[PDB]
Structure 1
């Protein structure tokens, strides 16, 4: 909408106060004009018609319980935009400052979040498996990263390419979480998963097997559930990424860690310069090795560590 840029204040899903960029024209809208061609947050009103209505508020204060998922979707989209711009020189998901749109309060008791091809969509959860999913910065960045993938590598959402697609979203979700630097970890969705159970998460990158996800290619799922296991086999790539960054010895194979920033550079380059819609795990290894070679040189520690990590998870 046409209006003047304003700054509202509110509370997110976890009860934390934050400022949000809004737009004033009769109402205050969740429209952040400070980033690209805008970040827009919508109310789906417990229904499934999208996007719903651009979020309107009378007083620019967002402290109601109903407001909380909108505050966080809007704010964490901003953080994710900042990460891609500041760290990778990428302007929004398309590289040309496309408007970023999110809808919250999608459906009823909805235990998921997704990119629908055009926008991000967040359920409120059922209060048992999830609380509103935009409360997780890693979740928001995971979703926006699906848009980045779709505009770049275009990894088909099934089997090995789909598991890479998922892992890319978990990797950058985690790197954005570290970028914001509030309780960062290598777990996925811990802030919004199972409010009645402390210390767990939806997935773990550091130890995928803690939730039954494979951490070695020999343990990959090859059935048809979950688009051929895209949220399961992602553990194999998540583990490799974790090892590249943090190091470790895994099934007897030692990996020298090179840190998060270099992991991000290597995987961003692989995603945008080498991966294709049909890339499999072996092709991802090759893409990561080539990316590290481009950035750091063939004889570098970074290249050696990429090879070690993929060796450790059984991907040749």
Structure 2
């Protein structure tokens, strides 16, 4: 829309009030002109045609139950944009301020969210396994990170390359959650998963085995389900990232932690300079070692800790 930038107010999926950047031209649209070439949020109206209609509102107030997933998709896309710009000097997912588009209310009872090659897409959940998935800042940032990966390393979404793809999205989703600094943790999807059960999540980076995922290369899945286990074997890499940041001893191997900020620098460099569409876990180790060497020096603690972390998860 061509109009004037405005600031609306609404409530997200978890019932929290937030301001959102909108545009006015007869209606107020979920179009944020303050970031890049815009952030645009669409209504898929419980159908699967995409993107659907650019979200329009008569009064710039977004407090209806139907509005909540749009409010959060739109707001958390802005947070994720800010993280990549402020922390990594990256302008949108293509590095040239590409428009960021999301659709909410996708299908009926849809227990998932995804990047479809052109935009983010969020289901409302069935109210039992999930509530609307855009309520999770880690979920929104996970999806937008798939766009970043597709424009950079382009990790093929199958087998070991696909597991790295998934782990990169869990890592940056978590780092974005810590950047926004509201109830941050190393779990994925806890804000929107199983409303009737407290304390669980979809996956854990700190303890992948908690939710049945491998935390060592010896326990990797090698069958064909889930594109050869992309959301399963991501646990091996998620654990290595957790260890690089936080430290710990895992199967007897001790890792000196170096903190989230350096974890983010090392993985962002690996993703944008060293990883390729066919990279496997061993090649990820080399890419992370080279990135840490570039940033901190071959004799640094940071390099030593990357090696320790990959050793701890059985990746040579």
Q: TM-score, normalised by structure 2?
A: 1.00
Q: Corresponding residue for 1:240?
A: 240
Distance 2:43 2:268 in 1: 32
Over residues 149-192 of structure 1, what are the superposed CA-to-partner deviations in whole Å (9 max), with x where a residue is unaligned?
00000000000000000000000000000000000000000000
Task: Give the CA deviation at 1:217.
Answer: 0.1
Task: Give the CA deviation at 1:122.
Answer: 0.1
Over residues 264-288 of structure 1, what are the superposed CA-to-partner deviations in whole Å (9 max), with x where a residue is unaligned?
0000000000000000000000000
Q: Corresponding residue for 1:217?
A: 217
Task: Give the CA deviation at 1:138.
Answer: 0.1
Q: Structure 1, unaligned stretches of length 5 or more?
A: none
Distance 2:94 2:108 in 1: 31
Task: Give the CA deviation at 1:227.
Answer: 0.1
SS of the aligned residue for 2:114 comes to strand
SS of the aligned residue for 1:206 comes to coil
Over residues 43-102 of structure 1, what are the superposed CA-to-partner deviations in whole Å (9 max), with x where a residue is unaligned?
000000000000000000000000000000000000000000000000000000000000
Task: Give the CA deviation at 1:7.
Answer: 0.1
Q: Corresponding residue for 1:75?
A: 75
Task: Give the CA deviation at 1:200.
Answer: 0.2
Distance 2:286 2:272 in 1: 14
Q: Corresponding residue for 1:95?
A: 95
Over residues 220-277 of structure 1, what are the superposed CA-to-partner deviations in whole Å (9 max), with x where a residue is unaligned?
0000000000000000000000000000000000000000000000000000000000
Correspondence list, 1:116-265, <5 A: 116-265=116-265
Task: Give the CA deviation at 1:125.
Answer: 0.2
Q: Corresponding residue for 1:301?
A: 301
- State whether structure 2 residue 110 is matched by structure 1 residue 110: yes
Over residues 96-115 of structure 1, what are the superposed CA-to-partner deviations in whole Å (9 max), with x where a residue is unaligned?
00000000000000000000
Task: Give the CA deviation at 1:21.
Answer: 0.1
RMSD: 0.2
Distance 2:244 2:32 in 1: 36
Q: Corresponding residue for 1:275?
A: 275
Distance 2:228 2:183 in 1: 32
SS of the aligned residue for 1:96 comes to coil
Distance 1:161 1:90 in 2: 23
Distance 1:128 1:162 in 2: 28
Distance 2:114 2:51 in 1: 13
Distance 2:38 2:302 in 1: 37
Task: Give the CA deviation at 1:314.
Answer: 0.1
Distance 2:262 2:117 in 1: 29
Distance 2:300 2:285 in 1: 16
Task: Give the CA deviation at 1:296.
Answer: 0.1
Over residues 123-165 of structure 1, what are the superposed CA-to-partner deviations in whole Å (9 max), with x where a residue is unaligned?
0000000000000000000000000000000000000000000
Task: Give the CA deviation at 1:39.
Answer: 0.0
> How many aligned residue pairs are there?
316
Distance 1:300 1:128 in 2: 48
- State whether structure 2 residue 292 is matched by structure 1 residue 292: yes
SS of the aligned residue for 2:76 comes to helix
Q: Structure 2, unaligned stretches of length 5 or more?
A: none
